[PDB]
Design a protein around this ligand. Sequence first.
Ligand SMILES: CC(=O)SCCNC(=O)CCNC(=O)[C@H](O)C(C)(C)COP(=O)(O)OP(=O)(O)OC[C@H]1O[C@@H](n2cnc3c(N)ncnc32)[C@H](O)[C@@H]1OP(=O)(O)O
Ligand SMILES: CC(C)(COP(=O)(O)OP(=O)(O)OC[C@H]1O[C@@H](n2cnc3c(N)ncnc32)[C@H](O)[C@@H]1OP(=O)(O)O)[C@@H](O)C(=O)NCCC(=O)NCCS
Length: 290
Amino acid sequence: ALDWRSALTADEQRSVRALVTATTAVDGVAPVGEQVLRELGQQRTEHLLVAGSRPGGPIIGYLNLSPPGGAMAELVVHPQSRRRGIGTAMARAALAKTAGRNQFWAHGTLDPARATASALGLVGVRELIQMRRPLRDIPEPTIPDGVVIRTYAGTSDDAELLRVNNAAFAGHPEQGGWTAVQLAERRGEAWFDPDGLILAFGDGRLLGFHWTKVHPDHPGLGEVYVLGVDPAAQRRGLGQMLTSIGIVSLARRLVEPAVLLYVESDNVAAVRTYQSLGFTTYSVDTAYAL
Ligand SMILES: CC(=O)SCCNC(=O)CCNC(=O)[C@H](O)C(C)(C)COP(=O)(O)OP(=O)(O)OC[C@H]1O[C@@H](n2cnc3c(N)ncnc32)[C@H](O)[C@@H]1OP(=O)(O)O
Ligand SMILES: CC(C)(COP(=O)(O)OP(=O)(O)OC[C@H]1O[C@@H](n2cnc3c(N)ncnc32)[C@H](O)[C@@H]1OP(=O)(O)O)[C@@H](O)C(=O)NCCC(=O)NCCS
């Protein structure tokens, strides 16, 4: 019997982290994301834990259902316990619970997940591509005149940063409609670096920005965190220029060392921008749904 849980004890949290770490070791990819791990100690989501056979043992399966669109499920069956129906039972429980509306996130779109998706009658409905490029032979930015580049100067720049982010991402489910609240939350994170947030102004109104990120726990890697160009300043070479400047900045500050990014497979403009700068597909995350 699969019992939906709204909260977990400390031991259960430890049990789930153990299952996740054991799985990452074997699969080479973490089966659930970092936010799912942060939800383990909260009462904001719903969970399924499948216990092993005898008392005092580790768990063999886990699923998290995060409320939203439909909810999002992330799940994992221990490598030693696969092909026994556990993944299907948890997935079907999620589908029954959400009336067929939830999606499932397959990090890395590995063979087992693809096969399980096929067996469950699911199809890929979104592909988030992680692309990378090395820190060598990097591009050289071309700053057109009438444009000046500088880093974020603090709250003085928040009005323009929010305006441009919200104009570029208008209609975007989660990157659009930001307020000073979202900025504060990020600046409070240890990875924030104001000199890693690159701004281009007319020479002036903010034209676009490139927020880069180096996480203290992932040495050797830099990330494109948010890239946005005001629609009034798009299709003039600024997005490529900003990405290029960020690569130069990251390479100075920093598998193989690299700059990585995440881009929706159908974001034609961003995929083109990144492809022009030598990024190539590293892995793909697929959201599966009925
Ligand atoms: C839609 C999704 O599953 S999104 C899943 C995202 N999670 C992950 O990718 C995390 C890493 N992977 C895992 O934890 C597991 O491999 C899961 C969750 C994908 C599947 O868990 P399992 O308990 O092994 O699934 P289950 O036993 O229910 O398999 C159902 C069917 O899928 C197919 N299947 C599952 N894994 C494989 C595989 N490696 N190769 C071929 N077919 C497979 C088979 O048809 C299987 O039936 P069968 O075993 O009778 O032949
Ligand atoms: C992605 C984005 C930053 C590109 O900015 P930009 O200033 O228009 O970029 P550039 O002028 O340098 O153009 C870069 C490439 O995108 C293409 N492109 C730009 N707008 C396009 C559009 N509307 N349709 C199709 N292709 C487009 C350019 O032709 C160019 O192609 P090329 O690299 O093959 O030469 C901008 O379109 C934007 O902000 N998009 C919305 C926010 C977003 O999704 N950002 C990524 C998530 S962090």
